[PDB]
């Protein structure tokens, strides 16, 4: 359970996803790896796009130390991921819009250096701003409950 329960709990509790979301995500992660290496740190994006997603939401975790898992581009080389974006997204167009948005986030190195050291309240405010500032992603549910530091 790399990040899967820690960041899925609020999606289940607030009704964004079905209760067995975490298991479906794990199996799809095995088939479709989530790790991705940026010039800085790894940024991972777990997702499924099934019909068990009730509403669209982004759960973001920051890790104390990197977690080593396979790359999105089909490579066994583990990626030392520090930030994980679990995407509770219902369909294709919405997830591509989010991934395009995440790329803009990934490429903002100054943001990431800060992000690794941001408090939950600060993380919420800067991500919240980026989601709503963007012309895209209207309709995604993002709140303080979806911002978490992952112990170890």
């Amino acid at each position, epitope marked *: 359970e790399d990040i899967i329960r820690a960041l899925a709990s609020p999606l289940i509790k607030d009704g964004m996803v079905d209760e067995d979301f975490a298991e479906k995500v794990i199996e799809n992660e095995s088939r479709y790896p989530s790790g991705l290496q940026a010039k800085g740190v790894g940024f991972a994006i777990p997702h499924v796009l099934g019909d068990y997603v009730r509403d669209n939401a982004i759960s973001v975790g920051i890790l104390d130390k990197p977690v080593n898992f396979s790359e999105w581009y089909q490579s066994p080389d583990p990626v030392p991921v520090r930030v994980v974006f679990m995407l509770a997204i219902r369909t294709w167009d919405d997830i591509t819009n989010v991934m395009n948005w995440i790329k803009d986030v990934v490429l903002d190195e100054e943001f990431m250096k800060r992000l690794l050291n941001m*408090s*939950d309240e600060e993380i919420y*405010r800067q991500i919240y701003t980026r989601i709503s500032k963007a012309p895209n992603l209207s309709g995604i549910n993002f709140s*303080r409950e979806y911002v978490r*530091h992952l112990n170890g």
Partner: antibody
Amino acid sequence: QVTLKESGPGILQPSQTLSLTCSFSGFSLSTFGMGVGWIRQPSGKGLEWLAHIWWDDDKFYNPALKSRLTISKDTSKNQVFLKIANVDTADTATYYCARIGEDYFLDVWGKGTTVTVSS
Amino acid sequence: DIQMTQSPASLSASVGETVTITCRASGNIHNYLAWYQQKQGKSPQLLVYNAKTLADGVPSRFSGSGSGTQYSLKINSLQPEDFGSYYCQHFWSAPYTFGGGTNLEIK
């Protein structure tokens, strides 16, 4: 000019609910990144966190006290309210309303209501 | 919840002397710590925020530094008005609790 003023009861009897109202001023409480909260200081003691309201209506409480209290917002006429149930003599203290700024900023630190509890 | 422990409980210094106050966290609080000071009969004022810089209106005679779990405040040329009760407030993760503070008095 941002400033916080307060009003509440003088003497409360043990087990009664304590109602403290803070008059908020100088900016909107709805302003992004801002909030207000309460800090308690029993005479002769240091400071304790008591309660917190965010611009987005999120709420925090000190877990040691939490089961007895709720905090609420009403932006109509700038009101901040704190309500603590089952207050004991142990809760005699100065209760301060502080302004919170974006990325954490306790500054206004309004004068404290003095609350005492006795028979 | 991460707690702050202050040390020493009390300080004794002459006017014009330099003193330091140390606070350490029960966990890593990165850069979000604030230092406050209380005069008798008044609410405390903000001295230092984001664990390092001075608030507007705050004298240049003092500052602070640190990282991770431990920070300190250093005040040079203490003036009579600088003698009072000091507090460390934790901001990494809410509730925004305080250590118990320290008490600085004139020799």
